[PDB]
Short mmCIF file of C-alpha atoms and ligand atoms in Angstrom, two decimals:
data_model
loop_
_atom_site.label_atom_id
_atom_site.label_comp_id
_atom_site.label_asym_id
_atom_site.label_seq_id
_atom_site.Cartn_x
_atom_site.Cartn_y
_atom_site.Cartn_z
CA UNK X 1 122.20 101.53 104.52
CA UNK X 2 123.20 102.56 100.92
CA UNK X 3 120.10 101.30 99.24
CA UNK X 4 118.22 103.05 102.21
CA UNK X 5 120.07 106.18 101.43
CA UNK X 6 119.09 105.97 97.83
CA UNK X 7 115.40 105.81 98.74
CA UNK X 8 115.93 108.47 101.38
CA UNK X 9 117.35 110.81 98.70
CA UNK X 10 114.41 110.14 96.10
CA UNK X 11 111.80 110.86 98.65
CA UNK X 12 113.62 114.05 99.81
CA UNK X 13 113.62 115.07 96.09
CA UNK X 14 109.94 114.26 95.47
CA UNK X 15 108.88 116.08 98.50
CA UNK X 16 111.04 119.07 97.57
CA UNK X 17 109.19 119.71 94.20
CA UNK X 18 106.04 119.70 96.09
CA UNK X 19 107.49 122.29 98.47
CA UNK X 20 109.06 124.37 95.54
CA UNK X 21 105.53 124.42 94.31
CA UNK X 22 103.83 125.52 97.46
CA UNK X 23 103.06 129.18 98.66
CA UNK X 24 104.44 130.10 101.98
CA UNK X 25 105.21 133.86 101.96
CA UNK X 26 103.15 137.04 101.95
CA UNK X 27 102.06 137.79 98.32
CA UNK X 28 101.87 141.52 97.55
CA UNK X 29 100.16 143.23 94.62
CA UNK X 30 99.31 146.63 93.54
CA UNK X 31 95.57 148.01 93.63
CA UNK X 32 95.74 151.00 91.32
CA UNK X 33 92.14 152.16 91.53
CA UNK X 34 92.51 152.24 95.58
CA UNK X 35 95.99 153.76 95.48
CA UNK X 36 97.12 150.93 97.60
CA UNK X 37 97.85 147.26 97.86
CA UNK X 38 96.41 143.71 98.32
CA UNK X 39 98.10 140.80 100.02
CA UNK X 40 97.06 137.23 100.40
CA UNK X 41 98.88 134.31 102.34
CA UNK X 42 98.21 131.19 104.65
CA UNK X 43 99.52 130.72 107.93
CA UNK X 44 100.26 127.13 109.31
CA UNK X 45 99.38 127.17 112.97
CA UNK X 46 100.88 123.95 114.84
CA UNK X 47 98.34 122.15 116.52
CA UNK X 48 99.67 120.92 119.99
CA UNK X 49 99.58 117.13 119.70
CA UNK X 50 100.01 117.14 115.86
CA UNK X 51 98.60 118.61 112.69
CA UNK X 52 98.36 121.85 111.21
CA UNK X 53 95.46 124.84 111.41
CA UNK X 54 95.43 126.90 108.32
CA UNK X 55 94.58 130.41 108.56
CA UNK X 56 93.86 132.10 105.04
CA UNK X 57 94.42 135.85 104.96
CA UNK X 58 93.33 138.27 102.68
CA UNK X 59 94.50 142.08 102.92
CA UNK X 60 93.95 145.45 101.69
CA UNK X 61 95.92 148.74 102.31
CA UNK X 62 95.03 152.11 101.49
CA UNK X 63 96.84 155.55 102.22
CA UNK X 64 95.44 157.91 104.96
CA UNK X 65 96.91 160.77 103.42
CA UNK X 66 96.47 162.74 99.92
CA UNK X 67 100.21 162.60 98.84
CA UNK X 68 101.55 159.96 96.04
CA UNK X 69 102.45 156.57 97.37
CA UNK X 70 104.58 153.74 95.72
CA UNK X 71 102.50 151.01 93.90
CA UNK X 72 104.60 147.86 93.65
CA UNK X 73 105.05 145.29 90.99
CA UNK X 74 104.31 141.83 92.35
CA UNK X 75 106.68 140.65 95.16
CA UNK X 76 106.39 138.98 98.60
CA UNK X 77 107.55 139.13 102.10
CA UNK X 78 109.17 136.35 103.79
CA UNK X 79 108.88 136.51 107.83
CA UNK X 80 110.53 134.49 110.41
CA UNK X 81 108.97 134.81 114.05
CA UNK X 82 109.84 133.71 117.55
CA UNK X 83 107.42 133.93 120.32
CA UNK X 84 108.73 133.69 123.93
CA UNK X 85 107.65 134.63 127.55
CA UNK X 86 108.98 137.13 130.14
CA UNK X 87 109.52 134.88 133.17
CA UNK X 88 108.84 138.23 135.33
CA UNK X 89 105.42 138.93 133.72
CA UNK X 90 102.52 137.60 135.54
CA UNK X 91 99.81 139.04 133.02
CA UNK X 92 98.91 136.87 129.93
CA UNK X 93 101.49 138.18 127.48
CA UNK X 94 103.62 137.42 124.36
CA UNK X 95 107.21 138.40 123.73
CA UNK X 96 107.91 138.66 119.82
CA UNK X 97 110.93 138.56 117.81
CA UNK X 98 110.21 139.09 113.96
CA UNK X 99 112.35 139.34 111.01
CA UNK X 100 110.55 140.20 107.70
CA UNK X 101 112.41 140.64 104.25
CA UNK X 102 111.01 141.70 100.74
CA UNK X 103 112.01 139.16 97.78
CA UNK X 104 110.09 137.63 94.73
CA UNK X 105 111.88 140.09 92.24
CA UNK X 106 114.94 138.39 90.79
CA UNK X 107 118.08 140.45 90.49
CA UNK X 108 120.09 137.41 89.15
CA UNK X 109 123.43 138.48 90.59
CA UNK X 110 124.86 138.21 94.08
CA UNK X 111 125.47 141.42 96.19
CA UNK X 112 109.82 158.01 98.91
CA UNK X 113 110.38 160.74 101.72
CA UNK X 114 108.59 158.25 103.99
CA UNK X 115 111.42 155.96 103.71
CA UNK X 116 113.64 158.57 105.52
CA UNK X 117 111.67 158.05 108.53
CA UNK X 118 112.89 154.38 108.68
CA UNK X 119 116.79 154.78 108.53
CA UNK X 120 117.44 153.93 112.30
CA UNK X 121 115.28 152.36 115.32
CA UNK X 122 111.82 153.68 115.43
CA UNK X 123 109.74 153.28 118.83
CA UNK X 124 106.38 151.17 118.29
CA UNK X 125 103.10 151.20 120.15
CA UNK X 126 100.31 148.72 119.46
CA UNK X 127 96.72 148.79 120.69
CA UNK X 128 94.11 146.09 119.91
CA UNK X 129 90.23 146.06 120.96
CA UNK X 130 88.79 142.58 120.21
CA UNK X 131 85.66 140.66 120.41
CA UNK X 132 85.69 137.16 119.33
CA UNK X 133 82.35 135.27 119.59
CA UNK X 134 81.46 137.96 122.26
CA UNK X 135 84.43 137.46 124.29
CA UNK X 136 85.61 141.15 124.41
CA UNK X 137 89.46 141.78 125.12
CA UNK X 138 92.25 144.23 124.61
CA UNK X 139 96.02 143.79 123.77
CA UNK X 140 98.61 146.62 124.58
CA UNK X 141 102.29 146.31 122.97
CA UNK X 142 105.48 148.32 122.83
CA UNK X 143 108.83 147.75 121.33
CA UNK X 144 110.91 148.98 118.49
CA UNK X 145 111.28 148.39 114.87
CA UNK X 146 114.69 148.84 112.57
CA UNK X 147 113.60 148.54 108.91
CA UNK X 148 117.47 148.18 107.90
CA UNK X 149 117.52 144.56 109.24
CA UNK X 150 113.80 144.09 108.96
CA UNK X 151 113.48 143.57 112.67
CA UNK X 152 110.77 143.88 115.25
CA UNK X 153 111.18 143.48 118.89
CA UNK X 154 107.74 144.00 120.99
CA UNK X 155 106.07 142.80 124.16
CA UNK X 156 102.43 142.48 124.16
CA UNK X 157 99.82 142.27 127.31
CA UNK X 158 96.46 141.11 127.44
CA UNK X 159 95.06 144.14 129.50
CA UNK X 160 91.72 142.48 130.00
CA UNK X 161 92.98 139.33 131.83
CA UNK X 162 93.34 136.03 129.99
CA UNK X 163 93.32 136.26 126.20
CA UNK X 164 90.40 133.98 124.77
CA UNK X 165 92.20 132.90 121.67
CA UNK X 166 95.77 131.88 121.25
CA UNK X 167 98.50 134.42 120.93
CA UNK X 168 99.78 132.98 117.61
CA UNK X 169 96.50 133.72 115.97
CA UNK X 170 97.05 137.33 116.55
CA UNK X 171 100.64 137.68 115.50
CA UNK X 172 99.76 138.99 112.05
CA UNK X 173 97.24 141.46 113.01
CA UNK X 174 99.69 142.89 115.88
CA UNK X 175 103.65 146.99 110.93
CA UNK X 176 104.74 145.79 107.44
CA UNK X 177 106.58 149.31 107.05
CA UNK X 178 109.35 147.74 109.04
CA UNK X 179 109.93 145.37 106.22
CA UNK X 180 113.65 145.23 104.77
CA UNK X 181 113.32 146.07 101.15
CA UNK X 182 116.51 145.18 99.16
CA UNK X 183 118.22 147.98 97.29
CA UNK X 184 116.69 146.51 94.05
CA UNK X 185 113.26 146.69 95.21
CA UNK X 186 112.97 150.12 97.24
CA UNK X 187 110.61 151.40 94.44
CA UNK X 188 108.10 148.70 95.48
CA UNK X 189 107.75 149.65 99.41
CA UNK X 190 104.28 151.00 99.49
CA UNK X 191 104.14 150.82 103.32
CA UNK X 192 107.02 153.33 104.00
CA UNK X 193 106.00 155.67 101.29
CA UNK X 194 102.53 156.18 102.81
CA UNK X 195 104.27 157.63 105.84
CA UNK X 196 104.08 159.58 108.23
CA UNK X 197 100.32 160.01 107.32
CA UNK X 198 100.00 156.09 107.26
CA UNK X 199 97.68 153.71 105.86
CA UNK X 200 94.51 151.83 106.81
CA UNK X 201 95.14 147.91 106.83
CA UNK X 202 92.29 145.55 106.58
CA UNK X 203 92.02 141.80 106.70
CA UNK X 204 89.69 138.85 106.84
CA UNK X 205 91.39 135.80 108.07
CA UNK X 206 89.74 132.57 107.64
CA UNK X 207 90.58 129.67 110.15
CA UNK X 208 89.73 126.66 108.00
CA UNK X 209 86.85 124.62 109.47
CA UNK X 210 86.39 127.31 112.23
CA UNK X 211 85.65 131.18 112.60
CA UNK X 212 87.21 134.36 111.02
CA UNK X 213 88.66 137.57 112.10
CA UNK X 214 88.14 140.58 110.26
CA UNK X 215 90.35 143.57 111.40
CA UNK X 216 90.68 147.03 110.57
CA UNK X 217 93.99 149.08 111.60
CA UNK X 218 95.53 152.56 111.13
CA UNK X 219 99.15 152.49 110.98
CA UNK X 220 100.79 155.94 111.11
CA UNK X 221 103.46 157.97 112.77
CA UNK X 222 102.48 160.29 115.83
CA UNK X 223 105.48 162.31 116.43
CA UNK X 224 108.43 160.08 116.33
CA UNK X 225 106.34 156.72 117.06
CA UNK X 226 104.86 154.49 114.70
CA UNK X 227 101.44 153.24 116.07
CA UNK X 228 99.47 150.27 115.13
CA UNK X 229 95.69 150.93 116.29
CA UNK X 230 93.64 147.82 115.63
CA UNK X 231 89.95 146.51 115.89
CA UNK X 232 89.27 142.93 115.55
CA UNK X 233 86.05 141.06 115.27
CA UNK X 234 85.88 137.29 115.40
CA UNK X 235 82.70 135.08 114.54
CA UNK X 236 81.50 131.57 114.01
CA UNK X 237 84.11 129.94 116.08
CA UNK X 238 83.69 126.65 117.54
CA UNK X 239 84.05 126.70 121.20
CA UNK X 240 85.60 123.36 121.23
CA UNK X 241 87.81 124.11 118.30
CA UNK X 242 91.60 124.84 117.97
CA UNK X 243 91.22 128.58 118.54
CA UNK X 244 88.63 129.12 121.50
CA UNK X 245 89.81 125.65 122.65
CA UNK X 246 93.51 126.79 122.83
CA UNK X 247 94.91 123.76 121.02
CA UNK X 248 97.68 125.69 119.15
CA UNK X 249 101.14 125.53 119.82
CA UNK X 250 102.74 128.49 121.12
CA UNK X 251 106.17 128.60 119.76
CA UNK X 252 107.53 126.14 117.23
CA UNK X 253 111.32 125.70 118.48
CA UNK X 254 111.71 123.01 115.86
CA UNK X 255 115.05 123.18 114.26
CA UNK X 256 116.56 120.45 111.88
CA UNK X 257 118.64 117.45 113.25
CA UNK X 258 122.39 116.58 111.86
CA UNK X 259 121.34 113.28 110.00
CA UNK X 260 118.37 115.42 108.59
CA UNK X 261 120.68 118.02 107.15
CA UNK X 262 123.03 115.28 105.88
CA UNK X 263 119.97 113.65 104.16
CA UNK X 264 118.95 117.01 102.80
CA UNK X 265 122.34 117.49 101.15
CA UNK X 266 122.24 114.27 99.43
CA UNK X 267 118.95 115.51 97.91
CA UNK X 268 120.33 118.95 96.96
CA UNK X 269 123.28 117.15 94.98
CA UNK X 270 120.59 115.13 92.96
CA UNK X 271 119.22 118.60 91.85
CA UNK X 272 122.74 120.35 91.55
CA UNK X 273 124.17 117.97 89.03
CA UNK X 274 127.17 120.21 88.02
CA UNK X 275 128.19 120.29 91.67
CA UNK X 276 128.45 124.18 91.79
CA UNK X 277 126.28 124.63 95.06
CA UNK X 278 123.47 126.16 93.32
CA UNK X 279 120.27 124.67 91.63
CA UNK X 280 119.27 126.58 88.58
CA UNK X 281 115.93 126.78 86.69
CA UNK X 282 117.63 124.19 84.16
CA UNK X 283 118.75 122.02 86.74
CA UNK X 284 115.25 121.97 88.45
CA UNK X 285 113.62 121.52 85.23
CA UNK X 286 115.70 118.36 84.34
CA UNK X 287 114.90 116.48 87.60
CA UNK X 288 111.13 117.60 86.95
CA UNK X 289 110.90 116.17 83.72
CA UNK X 290 112.70 112.91 84.75
CA UNK X 291 109.75 112.67 87.30
CA UNK X 292 107.28 112.92 84.41
CA UNK X 293 106.38 116.52 84.83
CA UNK X 294 106.42 119.29 82.22
CA UNK X 295 107.03 122.61 83.67
CA UNK X 296 107.00 125.93 81.67
CA UNK X 297 110.13 128.26 81.89
CA UNK X 298 107.98 130.59 83.70
CA UNK X 299 106.80 128.01 86.16
CA UNK X 300 110.48 127.09 86.83
CA UNK X 301 111.19 130.73 87.44
CA UNK X 302 108.44 131.13 89.86
CA UNK X 303 109.54 128.05 91.85
CA UNK X 304 112.86 129.10 92.34
CA UNK X 305 111.64 132.81 93.05
CA UNK X 306 109.54 131.23 96.01
CA UNK X 307 112.59 130.06 97.92
CA UNK X 308 115.19 132.51 96.62
CA UNK X 309 115.61 134.46 99.71
CA UNK X 310 118.52 136.61 98.33
CA UNK X 311 117.02 137.18 94.83
CA UNK X 312 120.27 135.67 92.78
CA UNK X 313 118.26 133.54 90.78
CA UNK X 314 119.32 130.16 91.90
CA UNK X 315 118.75 127.83 95.17
CA UNK X 316 121.75 127.52 97.59
CA UNK X 317 121.85 124.85 100.28
CA UNK X 318 120.65 127.30 102.95
CA UNK X 319 117.74 128.26 100.74
CA UNK X 320 117.03 124.48 100.15
CA UNK X 321 117.18 123.70 104.08
CA UNK X 322 114.74 126.61 104.82
CA UNK X 323 112.33 125.09 102.03
CA UNK X 324 112.55 121.52 103.50
CA UNK X 325 111.60 122.69 106.80
CA UNK X 326 108.18 123.60 105.34
CA UNK X 327 105.46 121.48 106.63
CA UNK X 328 102.99 120.07 104.09
CA UNK X 329 99.85 118.21 105.57
CA UNK X 330 100.27 114.67 105.98
CA UNK X 331 97.66 114.34 103.15
CA UNK X 332 99.62 116.93 100.73
CA UNK X 333 102.86 115.15 100.31
CA UNK X 334 100.17 112.34 99.54
CA UNK X 335 99.56 113.42 96.09
CA UNK X 336 103.33 114.18 95.17
CA UNK X 337 104.12 110.41 96.20
CA UNK X 338 101.06 109.01 94.20
CA UNK X 339 102.19 111.05 91.15
CA UNK X 340 105.75 109.68 91.76
CA UNK X 341 104.60 106.24 91.89
CA UNK X 342 102.75 106.41 88.56
CA UNK X 343 105.84 107.69 87.00
CA UNK X 344 108.29 104.93 88.34
CA UNK X 345 105.63 102.14 87.41
CA UNK X 346 106.36 102.57 83.70
CA UNK X 347 103.91 99.97 82.23
CA UNK X 348 100.94 101.09 84.86
CA UNK X 349 100.67 97.57 86.34
CA UNK X 350 100.80 98.89 89.76
CA UNK X 351 104.03 97.37 90.69
CA UNK X 352 107.44 99.03 90.30
CA UNK X 353 109.70 96.32 88.81
CA UNK X 354 113.59 96.24 89.21
CA UNK X 355 113.90 97.42 85.51
CA UNK X 356 111.43 100.34 85.88
CA UNK X 357 113.35 101.30 89.35
CA UNK X 358 116.86 101.35 87.48
CA UNK X 359 115.15 102.97 84.44
CA UNK X 360 114.09 105.86 86.46
CA UNK X 361 117.07 105.95 88.80
CA UNK X 362 119.30 106.27 85.92
CA UNK X 363 117.35 109.08 84.41
CA UNK X 364 117.58 110.67 87.86
CA UNK X 365 121.45 110.35 87.37
CA UNK X 366 122.16 107.37 89.83
CA UNK X 367 124.07 104.85 87.60
CA UNK X 368 123.29 101.77 89.80
CA UNK X 369 124.72 98.39 89.37
CA UNK X 370 122.22 95.00 88.85
CA UNK X 371 122.92 94.51 92.55
CA UNK X 372 122.37 97.90 93.70
CA UNK X 373 119.02 98.00 92.00
CA UNK X 374 118.06 94.51 93.58
CA UNK X 375 119.39 95.94 96.93
CA UNK X 376 116.97 98.79 96.51
CA UNK X 377 113.93 96.60 95.33
CA UNK X 378 114.82 94.28 98.37
CA UNK X 379 114.65 97.20 100.78
CA UNK X 380 111.16 98.04 99.96
CA UNK X 381 109.67 94.69 99.06
CA UNK X 382 107.59 94.03 102.31
CA UNK X 383 105.31 91.52 100.77
CA UNK X 384 108.41 89.59 98.93
CA UNK X 385 106.90 89.60 95.59
CA UNK X 386 110.08 91.17 94.07
CA UNK X 387 108.51 94.16 92.86
CA UNK X 388 107.27 97.60 94.88
CA UNK X 389 103.65 97.94 95.20
CA UNK X 390 101.92 101.37 96.18
CA UNK X 391 101.83 100.70 99.89
CA UNK X 392 105.39 99.72 100.04
CA UNK X 393 106.59 102.90 97.95
CA UNK X 394 104.93 105.10 100.48
CA UNK X 395 106.77 103.61 103.33
CA UNK X 396 109.98 104.27 101.45
CA UNK X 397 109.35 107.73 100.45
CA UNK X 398 108.03 108.92 103.57
CA1 CA D 401 124.23 123.59 89.86
CA1 CA D 402 119.42 132.30 95.96
CA1 CA D 403 105.40 98.10 86.44
CA1 CA D 404 106.15 93.87 96.71
#
């Protein structure tokens, strides 16, 4: 089991570097000329019997009123969503709990008049009129937002009967003014600064190998209620694809196992060489270099920033756990592991020998004995040739 733990560990570190290089958040930038903002992000929709349907989002927001707004430096929003059902509700519907937090600006230490409209709980009304491939529909929703906690609680109904697209594909269209901006980032909250007059939010959402939604929404106060009024047009969908075919998973209740957390702590340790419970840009750097990469300082800083939910400048184990729960496609993961193979196979002969394995594991800070190295080789060596080929490496690293 201990040669297997060493392979487990190594596979997890290789995958961790890939995930630290991926972009899962909502990336916001200023658009000075338009007195607003742009955003881009990808949503990974789980496909019921396996796989991920990507939805590439592009976004622009512009103020409705004439007053000055806050134009942000580059940052992101991190969103966690739960979709559920009301067992009493006979209409086609969705119950949504969401938490949204601004991050991506590094404080490096542990901890608008519009903003005043958000200091407590605010009631919300949502209205959507859609047309996807000529299928006309309407959604109505109501709830509350509490921007102190970044929290949204809403129930939505399809008021025209059965919803012709899956509910998860509408979540992003169905009030980013309820994001929680940390105290060090209040100057960057464009969304609240545009209130009460509000903003227009426009998106195009490209479902890969399928159709697209284009949306236009007005988000503004009407008296004390924050209202999101939306028109959605979807075109070029496949009648048989994941959207019009209802092939998408509703809720992804999918928490990590105890063994998996156990395995992820061992991977964490391989990064956290000083043992202080944190991974710094330097520690990440050292691991990346022993795996044949040459990241710049700014690239290390960006990688940590992508997962540094608390903005303290380092990755702690909870942050690491969130990151390792990030899905990469079966075939994404794949270039990482190929790269790793080429790094392990020092002479490039297509086999990792025991001497080459030792060399790398040592540089990864496992000091192994002659026997421990042969134990690892034997574990992976399916064809018995005494060395590890690509196909055998894949088996161990996945
Ligand atoms: Ca450390
Ligand atoms: Ca952190
Ligand atoms: Ca070799
Ligand atoms: Ca072999």
